[PDB]
Design a protein around this ligand. Structure first.
Ligand SMILES: Cc1ccc(-c2cc(C(=O)O)c3[nH]c(CN4CCN(Cc5ccccc5)CC4)nc3c2)c(Cl)c1
Ligand SMILES: [Cl-]
Ligand SMILES: [Cl-]
Ligand SMILES: [Zn+2]
Length: 346
């Protein structure tokens, strides 16, 4: 356990908890985008995932929202054996975007971006960055400080695809009972490329809060004085470490492909490796964070970081992230752990 890590955790907490009108500005903007969307024939059934979210743990002005469409009786077809990327096949409100049997993501996104750019001019009471990529579909910069990512997703209440059968390896930590209840939850499909095909990536981002709010082997983890763990604190420090390193080397392109998603995936693999609440005592914060730092470094060094839900999907493969980029991050983190983390300064 370190007083530096603890002081950083206290700073992050005060930044997160203090009075901000930001979420209110975003809510206004989102509720009017959603209203103008429900007027359109194809986007009539659109809704916010949860009735907001943040990618970066340090920046309270950067937001992350999902607009979802329930797609009952969905037919999925795995693209090029990618395990995570699928064609969407099936009258219903989404027949307008069809090309034969396959549902077009590019055409759906073109209409989505069109209606938002139009509503950006409507709200005179917000600069839209039409940055290429399906997920997030759009990034708004409300005023000169606030940033909002909007993702369009399809929701399916059918059993999770076969590629997930060995994923969510939580049975020795959270129990097979919990693994089974979670697998009954829906799954999402976001427009993404594995670069010119009508493919959708499987998303289980909604499962994170479910586990983070009930993360112990003990049902009483963090519910009392004698059972306070450092799992969330470790996850927060891992995320801040990457954010600060990305900010430190933003002028070069070497850390552009790394995201908090990679940090989260590696952190949850350490949760599977260390299932006992005793392997996460709050007093051992320093050691636990280091087991997290060591595991992520091993991931980069071996070019192996499995999608937590799709074991055959390597987030760190040479085809997704180059060796040079991973070695650059490996060197940067090694310098941070061998200089008392200079990013955690103040
Ligand atoms: C145990 C466990 C559980 C869950 C995950 C998980 C899985 C996935 C995944 O895609 O399967 C993730 N994806 C991202 C990044 N996204 C960026 C875009 N945001 C849009 C949004 C905005 C608002 C509301 C919904 C959606 C959501 C967060 N974190 C993810 C985390 C992991 Cl690793 C382990
Ligand atoms: Cl925080
Ligand atoms: Cl992310
Ligand atoms: Zn706990």
């Amino acid at each position: 356990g370190a007083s530096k890590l603890r002081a950083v955790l206290e700073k992050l907490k005060l930044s997160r908890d203090d009075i901000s009108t930001a979420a209110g500005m975003v809510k206004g903007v989102v509720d009017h985008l959603l209203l103008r969307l429900k007027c359109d024939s194809a986007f009539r059934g659109v809704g916010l995932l949860n009735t907001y979210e943040h990618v970066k743990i340090s920046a309270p002005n950067e937001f992350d929202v999902m607009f979802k469409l329930e797609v009952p009786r969905i037919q999925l077809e795995e693209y090029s054996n990618t395990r995570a990327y699928y064609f969407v096949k099936f009258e219903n409100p989404l027949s307008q975007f069809l090309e034969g049997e396959i549902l077009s993501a590019s055409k759906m996104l073109s209409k989505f971006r069109k209606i938002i750019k139009e509503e950006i001019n409507d709200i005179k009471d917000v600069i839209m960055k039409r940055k290429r990529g399906g997920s997030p579909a759009v990034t708004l910069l409300i005023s000169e400080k606030i940033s909002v990512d909007i993702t369009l997703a399809l929701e399916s209440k059918s059993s999770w695809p076969a590629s997930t059968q060995e994923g969510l390896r939580i049975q020795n930590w959270l129990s097979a009972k919990v693994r089974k209840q979670l697998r009954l939850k829906p799954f999402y499909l976001v427009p993404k490329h594995a670069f010119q095909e009508e493919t959708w990536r499987l998303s289980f981002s909604h499962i994170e809060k479910e586990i983070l709010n009930n993360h112990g082997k003990s049902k009483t983890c963090c519910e009392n004085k004698e059972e306070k763990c450092c799992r969330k604190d470790c996850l927060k420090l891992m995320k801040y470490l990457l954010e600060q390193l990305k900010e430190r080397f933003k002028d070069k392109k070497h850390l552009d492909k790394f995201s908090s998603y990679h940090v989260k995936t590696a952190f949850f693999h350490v949760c599977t490796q260390n299932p006992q609440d005793s392997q996460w005592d709050r007093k051992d914060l320093g050691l636990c964070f280091d087991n997290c730092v060591t595991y992520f470094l091993q991931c980069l060094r071996t070019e192996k970081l499995e999608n937590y839900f799709i074991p055959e999907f390597n987030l760190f493969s040479s085809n997704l992230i180059d060796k040079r980029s991973k070695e650059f991050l490996t060197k940067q983190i090694e310098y941070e752990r061998n200089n008392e983390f200079p990013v955690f300064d103040e």
